[PDB]
């Protein structure tokens, strides 16, 4: 019945007291957090409260679109020794920090992912060379599907792979993907091992990395420049902005205190000092 | 079963969930989900591997977290034949899905490729 945009509990007028009631007294040993409102420890006037928790609702908290990855590609000359660089990226929020930390306050979740692609470009050589408006392809290769080998192989024919042809200089590309989780909720943390070391086997064959799983495996993105080789090398960056929408979460955890190090819960040394100096008896 | 009419037998086709030792002895495969099969007038049999998996769907690839298991066939007695009968024969297998079999998230296959 209570929604987000509802007014918080109205403060009630309270006066002098001398009773067998003990609001102020608790014992945090019970695990229970003592619920004390204003009209308890002090005499408060009647206040028709107006503040609402609207903007603090789960949906609202993650209501921004974060930068998950930067993918580099180019379009080098037909005469270059190197191959036309096409980008491949493992789909994950973890690569950066921000979006990750926010997703860390909870143990689990369900959310339809909405993606954004703000592509940029530029020349590289000190040549007054020309380049026509470039076309971009964003290709979603699910787990175990043909990942491209060249910038021009049968794979990009994508008879079944959902791709996005972006024409540079237009309103950024966008797609929506629902809950593709193999579970019931995507596990931001996972206490375990994909394999179980066995006894009539060898340490090699039953060794697995702690913390990982297939849960957080969804596929990779492959981006290229659909235009062929051009007389002037034109590099390009693909920024991916992800925004969780229609979100739910389960069981809170404390936010990441120290600086990140890897996709694991691991921490590097020298970054173990989160706080600063401040006296106990000084304001 | 594709052996003569005068040939007989009993076999133990089995299915054990994953996350343990792959069984190499009847005794172990016998400890799991199996269907003891008798060879007779009804030449074919069917063992149903019911869905017993951690997730709601498994990766179509070679991944451990979503690993499937182990299917194994073993002699429950042995093959018995009389005189004037071939001592060797063949058995064909046929895999299919049960009505509750479903799939999701379409992608491209790898079983074909256009090179050049």
């Amino acid at each position: 019945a209570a929604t987000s945009r509802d007014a918080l509990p109205n403060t009630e007028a309270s006066g002098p007291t001398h009773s067998k009631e003990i609001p102020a007294l608790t014992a945090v040993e019970t695990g229970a957090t003592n619920p004390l409102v204003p009209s308890d420890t002090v005499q408060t006037r009647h206040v028709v409260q107006h503040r609402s928790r609207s903007e603090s609702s789960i949906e609202s908290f993650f209501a921004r679109g974060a930068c998950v990855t930067i993918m580099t590609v180019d379009n080098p000359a037909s005469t270059t020794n190197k191959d036309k660089l096409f980008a491949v990226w493992k789909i994950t929020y973890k690569d950066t920090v921000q979006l990750r930390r926010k997703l860390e306050f909870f143990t689990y979740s369900r959310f339809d992912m909405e993606l954004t692609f703000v592509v940029t470009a530029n020349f590289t050589e000190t040549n007054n060379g020309h380049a026509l408006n470039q076309v971009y392809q964003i290709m979603y290769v699910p787990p175990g599907a043909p990942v491209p080998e060249k910038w021009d192989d049968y794979t990009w024919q994508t008879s079944s792979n959902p791709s996005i042809f972006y024409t540079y200089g237009t309103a950024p590309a966008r797609i929506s993907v629902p809950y593709v989780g193999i579970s019931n909720a995507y596990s931001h943390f996972y206490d375990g091992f994909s394999k179980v070391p066995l006894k009539d086997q060898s340490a090699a064959l039953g060794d697995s990395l702690y913390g990982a799983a297939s849960l957080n495996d969804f596929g990779i993105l492959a981006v290229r420049v659909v235009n062929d080789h051009n007389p002037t090398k034109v590099t390009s960056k693909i920024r991916v902005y992800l925004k969780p929408k229609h979100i739910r979460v389960w069981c809170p955890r404390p936010p990441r205190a120290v600086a990140y190090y890897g996709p694991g819960v691991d921490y590097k040394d020298g970054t173990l000092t989160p706080l600063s100096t401040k006296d106990l008896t000084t304001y | 079963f594709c052996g003569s009419m005068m040939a007989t037998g009993k076999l133990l086709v089995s299915y054990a969930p994953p996350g343990a030792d792959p069984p190499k002895k009847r005794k172990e495969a016998m400890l799991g989900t199996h269907v003891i099969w008798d060879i007779g007038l009804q030449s074919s049999c069917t063992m149903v591997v019911p869905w017993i998996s951690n997730t709601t769907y498994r990766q179509t690839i070679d991944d451990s977290f979503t690993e499937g298991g182990y299917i194994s066939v073993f002699y429950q007695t042995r093959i018995v034949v009389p005189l004037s009968t071939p001592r060797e024969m063949d058995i064909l297998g046929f895999v299919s899905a049960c009505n509750d079999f479903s799939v999701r998230l379409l992608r491209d296959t790898t079983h074909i490729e256009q090179k050049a």
């Epitope: 990855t69 993918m71 580099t72 980008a87 491949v88 990226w89 493992k90 787990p143 175990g144 990942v147 080998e149 091992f193 994909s194 394999k195 090699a204 064959l205 060794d207 697995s208 990395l209 990982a212 799983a213 297939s214 495996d217 990779i220 | 690839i61 070679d62 991944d63 451990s64 977290f65």
Partner: nanobody
Framework: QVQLQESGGGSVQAGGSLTLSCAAS?????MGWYRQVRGKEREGVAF????????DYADSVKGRFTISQNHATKTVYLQMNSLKPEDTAAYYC?????????????????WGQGTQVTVSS
């Protein structure tokens, strides 16, 4: 489009141990499946999956080598112990996302420059 680099390789005696480092460009493990293929010419040693576990070693070296993943630095190593003269080979590192093909040298797409290791008798 990752770029490999073979570092931490050199001369040592017989019986000892040496470590090999393989840092990479990107967006590293994103091309997935890092490897260690020795031989003066071409022959595998270690193979590894960027996700999950997921080790496996060449029968010829089994139980003396280990390939590890440092996803933070983007470096894949190779701890070679109890070295023996037959270990003096041309070491390299590899990758292909294709979650399979670890038994074919020509199945790869990425290769580094290399580092000669010498198990001096």
């Amino acid at each position: 489009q990752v770029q490999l680099q073979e570092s931490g390789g050199g001369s040592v005696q017989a019986g000892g141990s040496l470590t090999l480092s393989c840092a990479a460009s990107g967006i590293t493990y994103c091309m997935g499946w890092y490897r260690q293929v020795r031989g003066k010419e071409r022959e595998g040693v270690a193979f590894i999956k960027t996700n999950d576990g997921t080790t496996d070693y060449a029968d010829s070296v089994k139980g003396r080598f280990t390939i590890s993943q440092n996803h933070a630095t983007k470096t894949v190593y190779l701890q070679m112990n109890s070295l023996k003269p037959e270990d003096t080979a041309a070491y390299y590192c590899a990758a292909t996302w294709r979650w399979s093909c670890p038994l074919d040298p020509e199945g790869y797409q990425y290769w580094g420059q290399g580092t000669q290791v010498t198990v001096s008798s």
